[PDB]
Ligand binder design. Sequence first.
Ligand SMILES: [Cl-]
Ligand SMILES: [Cl-]
Ligand SMILES: [Mg+2]
Ligand code: NA
Ligand SMILES: [Zn+2]
Ligand SMILES: [Zn+2]
Ligand SMILES: [Zn+2]
Length: 231
Amino acid sequence: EYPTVSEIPVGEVRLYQIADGVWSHIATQSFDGAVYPSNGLIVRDGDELLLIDTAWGAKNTAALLAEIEKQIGLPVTRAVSTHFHDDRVGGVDVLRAAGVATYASPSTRRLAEVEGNEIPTHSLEGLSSSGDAVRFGPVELFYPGAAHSTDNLVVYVPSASVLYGGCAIYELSRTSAGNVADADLAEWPTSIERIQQHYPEAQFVIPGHGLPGGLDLLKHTTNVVKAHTNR
Ligand SMILES: [Cl-]
Ligand SMILES: [Cl-]
Ligand SMILES: [Mg+2]
Ligand code: NA
Ligand SMILES: [Zn+2]
Ligand SMILES: [Zn+2]
Ligand SMILES: [Zn+2]
């Protein structure tokens, strides 16, 4: 039932329930002359919701908020962006206008400002060194080291054993690298090793784009990154 790129018109947002109190959000966007899906996460936080990542653009993110109200009916009170690119922060202004408290690490906020992307309001402390983890409501935020970007965070939901990798983890159907312009290709395998060592109990793994899977997505991503490094 997990929605794919061909089953989501650009501008629409679909939700998928992964576990009790954990959903992914799926949207699509035109980029480089193709259409790509993108995932984020929604995690129940008592009687509120924590959002992980925008829906890749202002229009998509407004649709995301509407779909959350229609399907779930709890308020989104906080959001975390897992790196500085537009598929993670594009729509932060919509969230802020809607009363959501937006968060990112200091490194993400700075990179967003340099790039000209939207800047989350609040800073997340305790994530400046590889291997750092902090609890943030019902999730753990982990900085594995540089990978897809130098600032990329991953998110673990302890109660549901859900690991959200963002753009640092590839879906299985992606067998060649994605956007690596800002990547640290040399460190990416080591950063994945840190994720594996820190979250070996994860049951569901959600990539930044495409279908969820298990922990096999981690080794798959290393294989693809290494192949790109050698090409
Ligand atoms: Cl705020
Ligand atoms: Cl606040
Ligand atoms: Mg930082
Ligand atoms: Na970008
Ligand atoms: Zn990115
Ligand atoms: Zn605030
Ligand atoms: Zn991406």
